[PDB]
């Protein structure tokens, strides 16, 4: 999902004719949404890590 | 006009998004005409210049 969710998308897939313009619907709070969740995942890896390391 | 009016169009121009397909009416019968069109003209052409030639 990389980090963020792009609000135009350029699509070019059967049957759509050549290629076509697709609208995302609220991008801005999915991006957000998806940026916290990296951040929290990230934050219980670095937990972990270091409970490892105390092992 | 060419010789020919083909029944589908790729049109890239604004409004229209990067480039969309548009279809002729009645693409054959105009083709037709044309072709029509310029035999005859041809023959018009043809007998100008015997005209000329006589003169």
Same mark, same amino acid.
């Given at each position: ?6 609000? @135009? ?7 759509? +004719?050549?290629? $076509? ?12 949404? @998806? ?7 990230? +934050?219980?890896? $670095? ?9």
């Amino acid at each position: 999902y990389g980090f963020s969710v792009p609000g @135009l998308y350029e699509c070019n897939r059967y049957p759509c +004719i050549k290629e $076509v313009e697709c609208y995302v619907s609220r991008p801005t709070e999915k991006t957000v949404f @998806l940026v916290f969740m990296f951040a929290v995942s990230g +934050i219980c890896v $670095v937990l972990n890590l270091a409970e490892l390391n105390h092992l």
